[PDB]
Amino acid sequence: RPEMRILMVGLDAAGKTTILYKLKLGEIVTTIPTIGFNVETVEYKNISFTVWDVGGLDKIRPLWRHYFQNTQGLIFVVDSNDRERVNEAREELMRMLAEDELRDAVLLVFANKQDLPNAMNAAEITDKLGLHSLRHRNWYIQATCATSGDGLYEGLDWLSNQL
Amino acid sequence: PSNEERKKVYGRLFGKQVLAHIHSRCQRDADIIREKALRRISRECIDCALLLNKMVDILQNARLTINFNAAKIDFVSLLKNKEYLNSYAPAYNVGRDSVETKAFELEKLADSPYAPYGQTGGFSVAYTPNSRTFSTTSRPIYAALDFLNGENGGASAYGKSFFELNDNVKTNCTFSPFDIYGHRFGLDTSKLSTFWHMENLIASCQNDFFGYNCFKSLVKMAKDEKFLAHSNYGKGYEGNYIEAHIHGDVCLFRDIKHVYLSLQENSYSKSQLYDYAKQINQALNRDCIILY
Ligand SMILES: Nc1nc2c(ncn2[C@@H]2O[C@H](COP(=O)(O)OP(=O)(O)O)[C@@H](O)[C@H]2O)c(=O)[nH]1
Numbered sequence: 001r002p003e004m005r006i007l008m009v010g011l012d013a014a015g016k017t018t019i020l021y022k023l024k025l026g027e028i029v030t031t032i033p034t035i036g037f038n039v040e041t042v043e044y045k046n047i048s049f050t051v052w053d054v055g056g057l058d059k060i061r062p063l064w065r066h067y068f069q070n071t072q073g074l075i076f077v078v079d080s081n082d083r084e085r086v087n088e089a090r091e092e093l094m095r096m097l098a099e100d101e102l103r104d105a106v107l108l109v110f111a112n113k114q115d116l117p118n119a120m121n122a123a124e125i126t127d128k129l130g131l132h133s134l135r136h137r138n139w140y141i142q143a144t145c146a147t148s149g150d151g152l153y154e155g156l157d158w159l160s161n162q163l
Numbered sequence: 164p165s166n167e168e169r170k171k172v173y174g175r176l177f178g179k180q181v182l183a184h185i186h187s188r189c190q191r192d193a194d195i196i197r198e199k200a201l202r203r204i205s206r207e208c209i210d211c212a213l214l215l216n217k218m219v220d221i222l223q224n225a226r227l228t229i230n231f232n233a234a235k236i237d238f239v240s241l242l243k244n245k246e247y248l249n250s251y252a253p254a255y256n257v258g259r260d261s262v263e264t265k266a267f268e269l270e271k272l273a274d275s276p277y278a279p280y281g282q283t284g285g286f287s288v289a290y291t292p293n294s295r296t297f298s299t300t301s302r303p304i305y306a307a308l309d310f311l312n313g314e315n316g317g318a319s320a321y322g323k324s325f326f327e328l329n330d331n332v333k334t335n336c337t338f339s340p341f342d343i344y345g346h347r348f349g350l351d352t353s354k355l356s357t358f359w360h361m362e363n364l365i366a367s368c369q370n371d372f373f374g375y376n377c378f379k380s381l382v383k384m385a386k387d388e389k390f391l392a393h394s395n396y397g398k399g400y401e402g403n404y405i406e407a408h409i410h411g412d413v414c415l416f417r418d419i420k421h422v423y424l425s426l427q428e429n430s431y432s433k434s435q436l437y438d439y440a441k442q443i444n445q446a447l448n449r450d451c452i453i454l455y
C-alpha cells in the first residue's frame with residue numbers, strides 16, 4: 001500500500017488526539033495528556049496514513065527535524081472557539097511554515113470544534129491564520145467536529161488527492 | 164477496526180496514561196526535586212543553576228539505545244518483524260508484571276477505561292496472563308539513555324549490537340537511575356522521571372565511591388571535560404546505566420535512527436553483513452545500518 005507521512009500539530013486542547021483516535025478507532029477517547037506524542041496508522045482509500053500527534057514541539061524542535069524531510073503532510077488543528085488564542089496559533093503556524101525542511105509539505109488546517117455555538121467558521125479562521133497571504137504552499141482548510149467526525153474524512157480526501 | 168487492533172490501541176493508551184501519571188508526579192514535586200538536585204550540585208563542586216541546566220541538556224540530548232545480541236538472535240528476523248517487542252509478546256513475565264505494577268503505580272489506574280487492557284489479571288499455570296484483553300502494547304519497551312556514548316551502546320550486557328532510536332522517542336519515556344527489576348531501585352516510584360524532569364534523575368542517580376560513578380561522569384561531561392567512560396558503564400545491571408522505558412511501540416525502521424551491528428558478535432559472516440548493510444541502507448536511502 002502507499003504510505004503518507006503526516007505531522008499533526010497545533011496548540012494544546014485544539015483536539016489533535018481526539019481527531020487521531022476518532023480516525024483510528026471511531027471513538028472519543030478519554031482526555032490523556034500528550035506528554036510526548038502519539039502515532040497511528042489509518043487505512044483510508046487504499047492509503048496508509050502515518051499520523052504523528054505531537055503534543056508540543058515548542059521546546060523540542062530539533063528532536064523532530066529528522067522526520068521533516070519526509071513529512072508529506074502537515075495537519076494544523078485549531079480551536080475555532082478559542083478566540084483568545086487564535087493569533088498564538090497563527091504565530092505557531094508561521095513558525096512551522098518557516099522550517100526549510102517542510103517547504104514541500106502540503107498544509108491541511110482543521111478548524112475544529114465547530115459544534116460550539118461561538119466558534120468562528122472556516123473563512124474567519126482562514127483570515128485570522130493568514131492563509132491567503134501564503135505563497136508557494138499547497139494548502140486547504142476544513143471545518144471539523146472531532147467529537148462527531150464531521151469534516152475529518154474530507155480533509156483525508158484532500159490529503160489523498162495531494163499524494 | 165479489528166478487535167485485536169483495538170486491543171493494541173487501548174494498550175497504548177493505557178501506557179500513555181502511565182507516562183502521564185509519572186509526569187504528574189514529577190510536576191507535583193518540581194520544587195523539592197530541583198532543590199535536592201541543586202543540593203547535590205553544590206555538594207559536589209560555582210553557578211549551580213547553569214550546571215544543572217547543562218546536565219539536563221546532556222541527558223535530554225543523549226541517544227536512546229536498545230541492545231541486542233546478534234549471535235543469539237537472528238537480526239534479519241528481528242528487522243523483518245517491522246517492530247520491536249517487549250517480553251510479553253516465560254516465568255520471567257510474572258516478576259516483570261509485579262515490578263512494573265509496583266514501580267509505575269499501575270493500581271492508581273484501575274479506574275481507567277483502559278485498565279482492562281493494561282492489567283494481566285494474574286498469570287495462569289503456564290505463566291500466561293489470565294485476562295483475554297490484556298495487551299502487550301500497555302507495557303513499555305526497555306531501553307537505555309546512553310549519555311556517555313558507550314562503545315557498545317547503553318546496556319552492552321544484552322548484546323554488542325544496539326538500535327539507536329530517533330530522539331523524539333525520548334519524549335515518550337520514563338527514566339530511572341537503576342533498572343527497576345534490581346535491588347537498588349527498591350521499587351521506588353519517586354526515582355522515576357519523564358523527559359521533561361531530568362532534574363529528578365540528577366537528584367536520584369548513583370554517586371558510588373568505587374567503580375563507575377554516574378553523577379561525577381555527568382558533572383564532568385557538563386563542564387565539557389574530555390574523558391573516557393568507565394569500563395563498567397553500561398556493562399552490568401543496577402546503577403551501571405540509566406534505564407529508559409519507552410511507552411509506545413518501536414517500529415523498524417520508522418523509529419530507528421541507526422542500527423549498530425557488531426561484526427565480531429554475529430551469526431552472519433563479514434561479506435553477508437556488508438551485503439545486508441548495503442541492501443538495507445540503499446533501500447532506505449539512509450545510513451541506518453552501521454557495522455562496527
Ligand atoms: N466541543 C468539542 N470539543 C472537542 C472537539 N475536539 C476535541 N474536543 C475537546 O477538547 C479537549 C482537548 O482535546 P485534545 O484531543 O486533548 O486536544 P489536544 O491537546 O490538541 O490533543 C477534550 O476535552 C476534547 O473533548 C470538538 O470537535 N468539539
Ligand SMILES: [Mg+2]
Pocket residue numbers: 013016017032033034053055
Ligand atoms: Mg493531545
